[PDB]
Coordinates of C-alpha atoms and ligand atoms in Angstrom, one line a residue:
Chain A
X7 CA -54.3 28.8 -23.1
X8 CA -54.5 32.2 -21.2
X9 CA -55.2 35.9 -22.0
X10 CA -53.0 39.3 -22.0
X11 CA -54.4 41.8 -19.9
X12 CA -57.1 44.5 -20.8
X13 CA -54.4 47.3 -19.9
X14 CA -51.9 45.8 -22.3
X15 CA -54.6 44.9 -25.0
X16 CA -56.1 48.2 -24.6
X17 CA -53.1 50.3 -26.0
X18 CA -51.2 47.2 -28.1
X19 CA -52.4 44.7 -30.5
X20 CA -50.2 41.3 -29.2
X21 CA -48.9 38.9 -32.3
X22 CA -46.7 36.6 -33.0
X23 CA -43.6 35.6 -30.6
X24 CA -40.0 36.2 -31.0
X25 CA -38.4 34.0 -28.3
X30 CA -38.2 35.0 -20.9
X31 CA -40.8 35.0 -23.5
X32 CA -40.7 38.0 -25.9
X33 CA -44.3 39.2 -28.2
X34 CA -44.3 41.5 -31.0
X35 CA -46.8 43.8 -30.5
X36 CA -48.7 47.1 -32.3
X37 CA -49.1 50.3 -30.2
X38 CA -52.5 51.4 -31.6
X39 CA -51.7 54.8 -30.7
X40 CA -48.9 54.8 -33.6
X41 CA -49.4 51.6 -35.6
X42 CA -45.8 50.9 -34.9
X43 CA -44.1 47.8 -33.9
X44 CA -43.3 47.3 -30.2
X45 CA -41.1 44.3 -28.3
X46 CA -43.2 43.0 -24.9
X47 CA -40.8 41.1 -22.8
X48 CA -42.9 38.6 -21.2
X49 CA -41.7 37.9 -17.2
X50 CA -43.8 35.4 -15.3
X51 CA -44.6 36.1 -11.9
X65 CA -40.3 40.5 -9.1
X66 CA -37.3 42.0 -6.6
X67 CA -35.1 41.8 -10.3
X68 CA -38.2 43.1 -12.3
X69 CA -38.2 46.2 -10.1
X70 CA -34.8 47.2 -10.4
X71 CA -34.9 46.0 -14.5
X72 CA -37.6 48.7 -15.0
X73 CA -36.0 51.2 -12.5
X74 CA -32.7 51.2 -14.4
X75 CA -33.9 51.3 -18.0
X76 CA -36.1 54.0 -16.7
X77 CA -33.1 56.2 -15.8
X78 CA -30.8 55.3 -18.7
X79 CA -30.4 57.3 -22.1
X80 CA -28.0 56.0 -24.8
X81 CA -28.7 55.4 -27.8
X82 CA -26.7 51.8 -27.4
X83 CA -29.2 50.7 -24.7
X84 CA -32.2 49.2 -25.8
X85 CA -35.7 52.0 -24.0
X86 CA -38.4 50.6 -21.9
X87 CA -41.6 52.3 -23.5
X88 CA -43.9 51.1 -21.1
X89 CA -44.7 48.7 -18.8
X90 CA -47.6 47.2 -16.9
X91 CA -47.9 44.5 -13.4
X92 CA -50.4 41.8 -13.7
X93 CA -50.7 38.0 -13.4
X94 CA -46.8 38.4 -15.2
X95 CA -45.2 41.3 -15.9
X96 CA -45.3 42.9 -19.5
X97 CA -42.3 45.2 -20.3
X98 CA -42.7 46.7 -23.1
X99 CA -39.8 47.7 -25.5
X100 CA -38.9 49.0 -28.9
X101 CA -38.0 46.9 -31.5
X102 CA -34.8 45.6 -33.0
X103 CA -35.3 44.2 -36.4
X104 CA -31.6 42.3 -36.8
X105 CA -32.9 40.1 -33.8
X106 CA -29.2 39.1 -31.4
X107 CA -25.8 39.0 -32.1
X108 CA -26.3 35.7 -31.4
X109 CA -27.7 34.6 -34.4
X110 CA -24.8 36.1 -36.7
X111 CA -22.1 34.4 -35.1
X112 CA -24.2 30.7 -34.1
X113 CA -22.0 27.5 -35.1
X114 CA -19.3 28.5 -36.3
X115 CA -20.3 31.9 -38.2
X116 CA -18.0 35.0 -38.2
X117 CA -18.3 38.5 -38.9
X118 CA -15.6 40.7 -40.4
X119 CA -13.4 42.1 -39.0
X120 CA -14.8 46.0 -39.7
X121 CA -17.9 44.6 -38.9
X122 CA -16.5 43.3 -35.4
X123 CA -15.6 47.2 -34.7
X124 CA -18.3 48.5 -35.6
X125 CA -20.6 46.5 -33.1
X126 CA -17.6 46.6 -30.7
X127 CA -17.3 49.7 -30.3
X128 CA -21.1 50.4 -29.7
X129 CA -20.8 48.0 -26.9
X130 CA -18.1 50.0 -25.4
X131 CA -19.8 52.9 -25.3
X132 CA -23.1 51.6 -24.2
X133 CA -20.9 49.6 -21.3
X134 CA -19.0 53.0 -20.4
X135 CA -22.2 54.8 -20.2
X136 CA -23.5 52.5 -17.4
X137 CA -20.2 52.0 -15.2
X138 CA -20.4 56.0 -15.4
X139 CA -24.2 55.6 -14.2
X140 CA -23.4 52.9 -11.2
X141 CA -24.8 49.9 -13.1
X142 CA -22.8 46.9 -13.7
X143 CA -25.1 44.8 -16.7
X144 CA -23.4 41.2 -15.6
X145 CA -24.9 39.6 -17.8
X146 CA -23.4 40.7 -21.7
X147 CA -23.7 38.0 -24.3
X148 CA -24.1 37.9 -27.8
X149 CA -27.8 37.0 -27.3
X150 CA -28.0 40.2 -24.5
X151 CA -26.9 42.0 -27.7
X152 CA -29.6 43.4 -30.6
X153 CA -28.9 44.8 -34.1
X154 CA -31.2 47.6 -35.0
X155 CA -31.6 46.1 -38.9
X156 CA -31.0 43.3 -41.4
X157 CA -27.9 45.4 -42.5
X158 CA -24.3 44.4 -41.3
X159 CA -23.6 48.2 -40.9
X160 CA -26.0 49.0 -37.9
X161 CA -26.7 50.2 -34.4
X162 CA -26.8 47.9 -31.8
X163 CA -28.4 47.5 -28.6
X164 CA -27.9 46.3 -24.9
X165 CA -30.2 44.7 -23.1
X166 CA -31.8 42.5 -20.5
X167 CA -31.2 44.4 -17.4
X168 CA -32.2 42.0 -15.6
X169 CA -29.2 40.4 -13.5
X170 CA -27.8 44.0 -12.8
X171 CA -26.8 45.6 -10.1
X172 CA -26.5 49.3 -8.7
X173 CA -23.9 50.8 -7.3
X174 CA -24.3 52.5 -4.4
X175 CA -22.5 53.5 -0.7
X176 CA -21.5 49.9 0.4
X177 CA -21.6 48.3 3.6
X178 CA -17.5 48.3 3.1
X179 CA -17.3 51.9 3.2
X180 CA -19.8 52.6 5.8
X181 CA -17.5 49.6 7.8
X182 CA -14.5 51.5 7.3
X183 CA -15.5 54.8 8.7
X184 CA -15.3 52.9 11.8
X185 CA -12.7 51.1 14.3
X186 CA -11.7 47.6 13.2
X187 CA -11.4 46.4 16.8
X188 CA -14.2 43.4 16.4
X189 CA -13.8 43.5 12.4
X190 CA -12.8 40.0 10.9
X191 CA -9.7 39.7 8.8
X192 CA -11.6 39.1 5.3
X193 CA -13.8 41.9 5.3
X194 CA -10.0 44.2 5.5
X195 CA -8.5 41.8 3.1
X196 CA -11.4 42.2 0.5
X197 CA -10.8 46.2 0.4
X198 CA -8.0 45.3 -1.6
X199 CA -10.7 44.5 -4.6
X200 CA -14.0 46.8 -3.6
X201 CA -15.2 48.5 -6.5
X202 CA -14.2 46.1 -9.5
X203 CA -17.1 44.3 -9.6
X204 CA -17.5 46.1 -13.3
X205 CA -14.7 44.3 -14.0
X206 CA -16.8 41.7 -14.7
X207 CA -18.8 43.5 -17.7
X208 CA -15.3 44.4 -19.4
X209 CA -14.4 40.4 -18.9
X210 CA -17.9 39.2 -20.6
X211 CA -16.9 42.2 -23.6
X212 CA -13.6 40.1 -24.4
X213 CA -15.5 36.4 -24.2
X214 CA -18.2 38.5 -27.1
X215 CA -15.6 39.8 -28.8
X216 CA -13.0 36.9 -28.9
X217 CA -16.3 34.7 -30.8
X218 CA -16.9 37.3 -33.2
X219 CA -13.3 38.0 -34.7
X220 CA -12.8 33.7 -34.5
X221 CA -16.4 32.5 -35.1
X222 CA -15.3 29.6 -31.7
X223 CA -15.7 30.3 -27.8
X224 CA -12.5 30.9 -25.8
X225 CA -13.8 28.3 -22.9
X226 CA -15.3 25.4 -24.3
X227 CA -15.8 22.0 -23.2
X228 CA -15.6 20.7 -26.4
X229 CA -12.4 18.5 -27.3
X230 CA -10.5 19.1 -24.0
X231 CA -9.9 17.6 -20.6
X232 CA -9.1 20.6 -18.3
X233 CA -13.0 21.4 -17.1
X234 CA -14.6 25.3 -17.7
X235 CA -14.0 26.4 -14.3
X236 CA -10.2 25.6 -14.7
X237 CA -9.8 26.9 -18.5
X238 CA -11.5 30.4 -17.0
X239 CA -9.9 30.6 -14.1
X240 CA -5.8 30.4 -15.4
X241 CA -7.5 32.6 -18.6
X242 CA -6.1 29.8 -20.6
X243 CA -8.6 30.7 -23.9
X244 CA -8.4 27.9 -26.2
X245 CA -6.2 29.6 -29.2
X246 CA -6.4 28.5 -32.8
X247 CA -3.8 30.1 -35.1
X248 CA -5.2 29.0 -38.2
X249 CA -9.0 31.1 -37.5
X250 CA -6.4 34.2 -36.0
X251 CA -4.4 34.2 -38.9
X252 CA -6.9 36.2 -40.7
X253 CA -7.5 38.6 -37.8
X254 CA -5.0 41.9 -37.4
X255 CA -2.6 41.6 -34.3
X256 CA -4.2 44.8 -33.0
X257 CA -7.3 43.0 -32.3
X258 CA -6.0 40.1 -30.7
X259 CA -4.3 42.2 -28.8
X260 CA -7.5 43.7 -27.4
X261 CA -9.0 40.2 -26.9
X262 CA -5.1 39.5 -25.0
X263 CA -5.6 42.8 -22.5
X264 CA -9.8 41.8 -22.0
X265 CA -9.2 38.0 -21.0
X266 CA -6.8 39.0 -18.1
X267 CA -7.6 36.5 -14.9
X268 CA -7.1 39.7 -12.4
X269 CA -10.1 41.7 -12.4
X270 CA -7.3 45.4 -11.0
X271 CA -5.3 44.8 -14.1
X272 CA -7.9 43.8 -16.5
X273 CA -9.0 46.8 -19.5
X274 CA -12.0 49.0 -18.7
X275 CA -14.4 50.8 -21.2
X276 CA -12.2 53.3 -21.2
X277 CA -9.0 51.9 -21.9
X278 CA -10.6 49.8 -24.1
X279 CA -11.6 53.0 -26.4
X280 CA -8.6 54.3 -26.2
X281 CA -6.2 51.0 -27.7
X282 CA -5.1 51.6 -31.0
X283 CA -7.4 48.9 -32.6
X284 CA -10.3 51.3 -31.9
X285 CA -8.4 53.9 -32.9
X286 CA -10.5 54.2 -36.7
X287 CA -12.3 57.3 -37.8
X288 CA -13.9 55.2 -41.0
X289 CA -15.8 53.5 -38.3
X290 CA -16.2 56.2 -36.2
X291 CA -17.9 58.3 -39.2
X292 CA -20.1 54.7 -40.0
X293 CA -21.2 54.9 -35.9
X294 CA -22.5 58.8 -36.3
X295 CA -24.1 58.4 -40.0
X296 CA -26.4 55.4 -38.1
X297 CA -27.2 58.2 -35.3
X298 CA -28.2 60.7 -37.4
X299 CA -30.2 58.3 -40.0
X300 CA -32.3 57.2 -36.8
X301 CA -32.3 60.2 -35.4
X302 CA -33.8 62.2 -38.0
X303 CA -36.8 61.0 -37.7
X304 CA -37.0 62.1 -34.1
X305 CA -35.5 66.0 -34.8
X306 CA -37.5 68.8 -33.8
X307 CA -36.5 71.6 -35.7
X308 CA -33.3 74.0 -34.0
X309 CA -33.0 77.2 -32.8
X310 CA -30.0 78.7 -34.8
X311 CA -27.8 81.3 -33.9
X312 CA -28.1 84.6 -36.1
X313 CA -25.2 87.5 -37.0
Chain B
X7 CA -36.0 71.7 21.4
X8 CA -38.2 69.0 19.3
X9 CA -42.1 66.8 20.7
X10 CA -42.2 62.6 20.3
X11 CA -45.5 62.1 18.1
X12 CA -48.4 61.5 19.6
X13 CA -48.9 58.1 18.7
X14 CA -45.7 57.1 21.0
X15 CA -46.9 59.8 23.8
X16 CA -50.2 57.8 23.5
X17 CA -48.9 54.8 24.7
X18 CA -45.7 55.8 26.7
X19 CA -44.7 58.2 29.6
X20 CA -41.3 59.3 28.5
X21 CA -38.6 59.7 30.3
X22 CA -34.5 59.6 31.4
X23 CA -31.9 59.5 28.1
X24 CA -30.0 55.8 28.7
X25 CA -27.3 56.7 25.9
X30 CA -28.3 56.0 18.2
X31 CA -30.1 57.5 21.4
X32 CA -32.3 55.2 23.4
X33 CA -34.9 56.7 26.3
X34 CA -37.0 55.4 28.8
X35 CA -40.0 55.2 29.0
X36 CA -42.7 53.8 31.3
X37 CA -45.9 51.8 29.1
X38 CA -49.6 53.2 30.5
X39 CA -51.5 49.6 30.1
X40 CA -48.5 47.9 32.7
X41 CA -46.8 50.8 34.4
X42 CA -43.9 48.9 33.1
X43 CA -40.5 49.9 31.8
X44 CA -39.6 49.7 28.5
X45 CA -36.4 51.0 26.5
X46 CA -36.8 53.4 23.1
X47 CA -34.4 53.9 20.7
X48 CA -34.6 56.8 18.5
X49 CA -33.4 56.2 15.1
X50 CA -32.8 60.0 12.9
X51 CA -34.4 59.8 9.3
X65 CA -35.0 53.9 6.7
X66 CA -33.7 50.6 4.8
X67 CA -31.5 49.0 7.7
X68 CA -34.7 50.0 10.2
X69 CA -36.5 48.2 7.4
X70 CA -34.7 44.9 8.0
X71 CA -34.0 45.3 11.4
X72 CA -37.6 45.4 12.8
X73 CA -38.1 42.9 10.3
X74 CA -35.3 40.5 11.7
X75 CA -36.5 41.2 15.4
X76 CA -40.1 40.5 15.2
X77 CA -39.4 36.6 13.5
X78 CA -36.8 36.2 16.2
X79 CA -37.7 34.3 19.8
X80 CA -34.9 33.9 22.0
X81 CA -34.4 34.2 25.7
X82 CA -30.6 36.0 24.8
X83 CA -31.8 37.8 21.9
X84 CA -33.6 41.5 22.6
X85 CA -37.3 41.7 21.8
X86 CA -39.1 44.3 20.1
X87 CA -42.5 45.5 22.0
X88 CA -43.4 48.3 19.6
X89 CA -42.7 50.7 16.8
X90 CA -43.4 54.4 15.7
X91 CA -42.6 55.4 12.2
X92 CA -42.7 59.1 12.2
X93 CA -40.1 62.5 11.9
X94 CA -37.6 60.4 13.4
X95 CA -38.2 55.9 14.1
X96 CA -39.1 54.9 17.5
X97 CA -38.3 51.0 18.2
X98 CA -40.3 50.4 21.5
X99 CA -37.8 47.5 22.9
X100 CA -37.6 45.5 26.5
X101 CA -35.7 47.2 29.4
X102 CA -32.4 45.6 30.8
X103 CA -31.3 46.6 34.0
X104 CA -27.7 46.1 33.8
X105 CA -27.2 47.5 31.0
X106 CA -24.2 46.9 28.6
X107 CA -21.6 44.6 29.1
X108 CA -19.0 47.4 27.6
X109 CA -19.3 49.3 31.3
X110 CA -18.4 45.8 33.2
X111 CA -14.7 45.8 31.0
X112 CA -14.1 49.6 30.3
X113 CA -10.9 50.3 31.2
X114 CA -9.1 47.2 32.4
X115 CA -11.5 46.1 34.4
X116 CA -11.7 41.9 33.9
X117 CA -14.4 39.7 34.6
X118 CA -14.5 36.4 36.8
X119 CA -13.6 34.0 34.4
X120 CA -17.0 31.9 35.7
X121 CA -18.7 35.5 35.0
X122 CA -16.7 35.5 31.3
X123 CA -18.2 31.7 30.6
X124 CA -22.0 32.4 32.0
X125 CA -22.0 35.2 29.3
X126 CA -20.1 33.4 26.6
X127 CA -21.8 31.1 26.9
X128 CA -25.1 32.7 26.3
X129 CA -23.7 34.8 23.4
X130 CA -22.8 31.3 21.5
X131 CA -26.8 30.3 21.9
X132 CA -27.8 33.5 20.4
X133 CA -25.4 33.8 17.7
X134 CA -26.5 29.8 17.1
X135 CA -29.5 30.8 17.0
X136 CA -29.2 33.7 14.4
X137 CA -26.7 31.6 12.2
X138 CA -29.7 28.8 13.0
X139 CA -32.6 31.2 11.3
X140 CA -30.3 33.0 8.5
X141 CA -29.3 35.9 10.2
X142 CA -25.6 37.7 10.8
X143 CA -25.3 40.5 13.0
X144 CA -21.8 41.8 11.7
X145 CA -21.7 43.6 15.1
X146 CA -21.2 42.1 17.6
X147 CA -19.1 44.0 20.3
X148 CA -19.7 44.5 24.4
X149 CA -22.0 47.8 23.8
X150 CA -24.2 45.1 21.9
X151 CA -24.8 42.8 24.9
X152 CA -26.6 44.1 27.4
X153 CA -27.1 43.0 30.7
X154 CA -30.6 41.6 32.6
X155 CA -29.3 42.8 36.2
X156 CA -26.9 44.6 38.2
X157 CA -26.0 40.9 39.8
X158 CA -23.2 39.5 38.0
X159 CA -24.8 36.1 37.5
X160 CA -27.4 37.3 34.8
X161 CA -29.3 37.3 31.6
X162 CA -27.7 38.4 29.0
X163 CA -29.2 39.5 25.3
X164 CA -27.7 40.6 22.0
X165 CA -29.2 43.6 20.6
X166 CA -28.8 46.3 17.5
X167 CA -29.6 44.6 14.6
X168 CA -28.7 47.5 12.4
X169 CA -25.8 45.9 10.6
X170 CA -27.2 42.6 10.3
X171 CA -28.0 40.6 7.0
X172 CA -30.5 38.0 6.5
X173 CA -29.0 34.8 4.1
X174 CA -30.9 33.7 1.4
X175 CA -30.5 32.0 -2.4
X176 CA -27.8 33.6 -3.9
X177 CA -26.8 35.9 -7.0
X178 CA -24.1 33.1 -7.1
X179 CA -26.1 30.1 -6.9
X180 CA -28.3 31.3 -9.6
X181 CA -25.1 32.1 -11.5
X182 CA -23.9 28.9 -11.2
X183 CA -27.0 27.3 -12.7
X184 CA -25.9 28.4 -15.9
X185 CA -23.3 27.8 -18.2
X186 CA -20.1 29.9 -17.5
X187 CA -19.0 30.8 -21.2
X188 CA -19.3 33.9 -20.2
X189 CA -18.6 34.3 -16.2
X190 CA -15.5 36.4 -15.4
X191 CA -12.5 34.1 -13.0
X192 CA -13.3 36.6 -10.0
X193 CA -16.8 35.0 -9.3
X194 CA -15.7 31.3 -9.9
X195 CA -12.5 32.2 -7.4
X196 CA -15.5 33.3 -4.7
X197 CA -17.2 30.1 -5.1
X198 CA -14.3 29.0 -2.4
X199 CA -15.8 30.8 0.1
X200 CA -19.5 31.9 -0.6
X201 CA -21.3 30.9 2.6
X202 CA -18.7 31.9 5.2
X203 CA -20.3 35.2 6.0
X204 CA -21.2 34.0 9.3
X205 CA -17.4 33.2 10.6
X206 CA -17.7 37.8 10.9
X207 CA -19.6 36.5 14.2
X208 CA -17.5 34.1 15.3
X209 CA -14.4 36.5 15.1
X210 CA -16.1 39.2 16.9
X211 CA -17.1 36.3 19.5
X212 CA -13.1 35.4 19.5
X213 CA -12.4 39.9 20.4
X214 CA -15.2 39.9 23.0
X215 CA -14.4 36.7 24.5
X216 CA -10.4 38.4 24.6
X217 CA -11.2 41.2 26.0
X218 CA -13.8 39.5 29.2
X219 CA -11.0 37.4 30.1
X220 CA -7.9 38.9 29.8
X221 CA -9.4 43.2 30.4
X222 CA -7.5 44.2 27.2
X223 CA -8.0 44.5 23.4
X224 CA -6.1 42.2 20.9
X225 CA -5.9 44.4 18.2
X226 CA -5.2 47.8 19.5
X227 CA -3.0 51.0 18.0
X228 CA -2.3 52.2 21.8
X229 CA 2.0 51.0 22.8
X230 CA 2.8 49.5 19.0
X231 CA 4.1 50.1 15.6
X232 CA 2.2 47.7 13.4
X233 CA -1.4 48.8 11.6
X234 CA -4.3 47.7 13.3
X235 CA -5.3 45.9 9.9
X236 CA -2.0 44.5 9.9
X237 CA -2.7 43.1 13.5
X238 CA -5.5 42.2 12.3
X239 CA -5.0 40.5 8.8
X240 CA -2.0 38.2 10.1
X241 CA -3.6 37.5 13.4
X242 CA -1.3 38.4 15.7
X243 CA -2.8 39.6 18.9
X244 CA -1.2 40.8 21.5
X245 CA -0.6 38.4 24.1
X246 CA 0.4 39.9 27.7
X247 CA 1.9 36.3 29.4
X248 CA 1.5 38.2 33.4
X249 CA -2.6 38.8 32.1
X250 CA -3.2 36.0 30.7
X251 CA -1.8 33.5 33.6
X252 CA -5.1 34.1 35.9
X253 CA -7.1 32.4 33.1
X254 CA -7.3 29.2 32.3
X255 CA -5.7 27.0 29.3
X256 CA -9.0 25.5 28.2
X257 CA -9.9 29.3 27.7
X258 CA -7.3 30.5 25.8
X259 CA -7.4 27.4 23.7
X260 CA -11.2 28.6 22.4
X261 CA -9.7 32.3 22.2
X262 CA -7.2 30.8 19.5
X263 CA -9.8 29.0 17.9
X264 CA -12.1 31.8 17.5
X265 CA -9.3 34.2 16.2
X266 CA -8.1 32.3 13.5
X267 CA -7.4 34.3 10.2
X268 CA -8.7 31.5 7.6
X269 CA -13.1 32.1 7.8
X270 CA -12.9 28.2 6.9
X271 CA -11.1 27.1 9.4
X272 CA -12.3 29.4 12.2
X273 CA -14.5 27.6 15.3
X274 CA -18.5 28.2 14.1
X275 CA -20.6 28.8 17.0
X276 CA -21.5 24.7 17.7
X277 CA -17.4 23.8 17.9
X278 CA -17.3 27.0 20.8
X279 CA -20.2 24.9 22.3
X280 CA -18.6 21.5 22.2
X281 CA -15.1 22.7 23.1
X282 CA -14.1 21.5 26.3
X283 CA -14.1 25.0 28.6
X284 CA -18.3 25.3 27.3
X285 CA -18.7 21.7 29.4
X286 CA -19.4 23.2 32.6
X287 CA -22.8 21.8 34.2
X288 CA -22.4 24.2 37.3
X289 CA -22.6 27.3 34.8
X290 CA -25.2 25.1 32.6
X291 CA -27.3 24.6 35.5
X292 CA -27.5 28.6 36.4
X293 CA -28.2 29.8 33.2
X294 CA -30.9 27.5 33.3
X295 CA -31.8 28.7 36.5
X296 CA -31.9 32.5 35.6
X297 CA -34.1 31.2 32.5
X298 CA -36.6 29.4 34.7
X299 CA -36.8 32.6 37.2
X300 CA -37.3 35.1 34.3
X301 CA -40.3 32.9 32.9
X302 CA -41.7 32.7 36.0
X303 CA -43.9 35.4 36.1
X304 CA -44.8 34.6 32.0
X305 CA -45.8 31.1 32.9
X306 CA -49.7 30.2 32.1
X307 CA -50.7 27.0 34.1
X308 CA -49.6 23.5 32.7
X309 CA -52.1 20.7 31.1
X310 CA -50.5 18.2 32.8
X311 CA -50.5 13.8 32.1
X312 CA -53.0 11.9 34.3
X313 CA -52.6 8.2 34.6
Ligands
HAU1 C1 -37.4 37.9 -38.4 C2 -37.5 39.0 -38.1 O1 -38.3 39.6 -38.7 N1 -37.3 39.8 -36.5 C3 -35.8 39.1 -36.4 C4 -35.8 39.0 -34.4 C5 -36.2 40.4 -33.6 C6 -36.5 40.7 -32.4 O2 -37.0 39.5 -32.4 N2 -36.1 41.4 -31.8 C7 -36.3 42.2 -30.7 C8 -36.1 41.0 -29.7 C9 -36.5 42.1 -28.7 C10 -36.4 43.2 -28.2 C11 -36.5 43.5 -26.4 C12 -36.7 43.5 -28.9 N3 -36.3 43.4 -30.6 C13 -37.6 40.6 -34.7 C14 -37.5 40.8 -36.7
HAU2 C1 -28.1 52.8 35.6 C2 -29.3 52.2 35.0 O1 -30.6 52.7 36.1 N1 -29.1 51.5 34.2 C3 -28.2 50.9 33.6 C4 -28.7 51.3 32.0 C5 -29.6 50.7 31.5 C6 -30.0 50.4 30.2 O2 -29.5 51.2 29.6 N2 -31.1 49.6 29.4 C7 -30.9 49.4 28.2 C8 -30.6 50.1 27.0 C9 -31.1 49.6 25.8 C10 -32.1 49.1 25.2 C11 -32.6 48.5 24.4 C12 -32.4 48.3 26.6 N3 -31.5 48.2 28.1 C13 -31.0 51.1 32.5 C14 -30.5 50.6 34.1
CL3 CL1 -55.3 37.1 -26.0
CL4 CL1 -42.6 66.0 24.3

């Protein structure tokens, strides 16, 4: 077989494989469970860690440690409920209220990413982790391997000069520049569609039109019998995220302002899950005195 | 004022400014002239040097040395005829035969770049250097600061998976992927237009239509009185490079196969300029013996 590097074994007791490969481990210092992501041997790994260290949001996975050996070892927090994929696999569908609670968190997470100049680019049910086995739980976005950092573009520098020698396709690209983040909103629309209905909107199963053609036209597979169980507001949101034009597509802010997300009961349940997890971390408070 | 770093002064005697800032210097070891490009203080500089060290073509400038101090110092070969810009500034126009000789070299240089996965992205008369004050001379492409290296794209990796969650604009982008190099061919068409005519094809002078609009429509300013002096073959080539669609636009290979470049006299003059410059470098030959 092979062995774990000495530096890792020093701080962690390695255990069972959880699914790159992810292993269960125990931090020796605390006796607490962690998840260790093993990445076989680089440029994406450098960016991934850098992104993970900068982010601080309750709906985004946190990096605990990192080891650079024969393979890369990213120590992450352990999520007991596993992937959202396992709750939707086959034709399993979540209760609409459960969809809302998880979707709201996904929007807050993606909104936080976009506010911080990060595009995930790989949002899918297998990259959404649940904090517990209970259906009302906190969710965390993970797997920042395909992610991209937004900064000052070469296009922005190109536009500071005279376009005497500049090609027309560069000038045509100015119309869409800065809409890259809209790929996350499309992905969010696909996750929401799956969660609400139990089936994917674009599939090669029981159809002639190519997957490519179903996507570029945005003609999702609508099954009325399945969707009758779902509210009009929920479907209206899916429809606004599954828009072909990335400039007309709903952003995370527009999705958060949508009537389907104006649910104080869902919001209170989320605030209740937050404070319950924070209860262990919470240091005493400097309180005002009259 | 300021001073040059000790490591540079050790090998070079710094002299007059030639124009970032470029200074004339003398290599102490050989007593030969060099040009030293001073870049004030990074990511483009790293890529520029890396590109320059890899390239070996007679129509591309060579890096001789590099110093990483308070500012970056790139030691390059000295070109005695200066920039092609100075031969075309105002309404100065080169003889058609001189255009051909210089253009042919620019095509060989750009073809070599494209074959080696490099896109220049900043081709213009000020980035073309002449080897001598004589009109029949060797030309060198310079200023690789805006250049881009072509490798395995994120798109190529994205297409290896199922597009269930993939946004339509990513799939739409597949049509044009890999045509980035065509920006150099557009720039070459603009340089050729200027060289042949003495005036730019797109200008804000004496017109109402915006520079952007003249470029995206590809409606260049054609002055028949100026172009009557020029051959139909030369204009036909300009027309094939100044094509709006980057997929229909002439590539360097198509431009090299164009009837205007099928001139053995021009080719012989280029081969004659090559061997004359190589004469000093030429080590003795291992010759066959019957
Ligand atoms: C069956 C079980 O005991 N599970 C379900 C799966 C779960 C799991 O892989 N979490 C996980 C995976 C990756 C990351 C980064 C975090 N957390 C552990 C508990
Ligand atoms: C007037 C004169 O003596 N010139 C014309 C200008 C010329 C010149 O700047 N070359 C140059 C500039 C940059 C680089 C990289 C190489 N080479 C030196 C000779
Ligand atoms: Cl081991
Ligand atoms: Cl000095």
